[PDB]
Amino acid sequence: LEEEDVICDGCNGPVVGTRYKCSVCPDYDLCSVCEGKGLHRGHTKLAFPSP
Ligand SMILES: [Zn+2]
Ligand SMILES: [Zn+2]
């Protein structure tokens, strides 16, 4: 089947658990690893569960 998966704009890895979606940039997300590394710090991101 076709599934919609979230891939990290930082490491191209899967975004599972908590996803950080930028509130300004279009279709931009980070995994918790890339967030921890402090990527995309200039913009406010939305943090919510990624099932
Ligand atoms: Zn990442
Ligand atoms: Zn942004």
Numbering used by the authors: -3 to 47
From the study:
Intriguingly, the autophagy adapter p62/SQSTM1/Sequestosome-1 was recently reported to recognize N-degrons, the N-end rule substrates of the well-characterized UPS, and where ultimately these substrates are delivered to ALS8,9. p62 is a key selective autophagy adapter that plays a role in the degradation of various cellular constituents such as misfolded proteins and their aggregates, malfunctioning organelles, and invading pathogens. Intriguingly, it was recently reported that the central ZZ-domain in p62 plays a critical role in the recognition of N-terminal arginylated BiP/GRP78 by the Arg-tRNA transferase ATE1. Here, we present the high resolution structures of the ZZ-domain of p62 in complex with 8 different N-degrons including type-1 and type-2, and subsequently identify key determinants involved in the unusual recognition.
However, an understanding of the manner by which the ZZ-domain binds to type-2 substrates is problematic since there is no deep hydrophobic pocket in the ZZ-domain, which is known to be involved in the recognition mode for type-2 N-degrons. Therefore, we determined the structure of the ZZ-domain in complex with a variety of N-degrons comprising three type-1 N-degrons and five type-2 N-degrons. As described for the R-BiP complex, two aspartic acid residues, Asp129 and Asp149, bind to the α-amino group, and Asp147 forms a hydrogen bond with the first peptide bond, which means that these interactions are conserved in all different N-terminal residues. However, the side chain of the N-terminal residue of the N-degron is recognized differently. Furthermore, the hydrophobic side chain of Ile127 guides the orientation of the side chain of the primary residue. Therefore, relatively small and branched hydrophobic residues at the primary position might provide very weak (or no) interactions with the binding patch of the ZZ-domain.
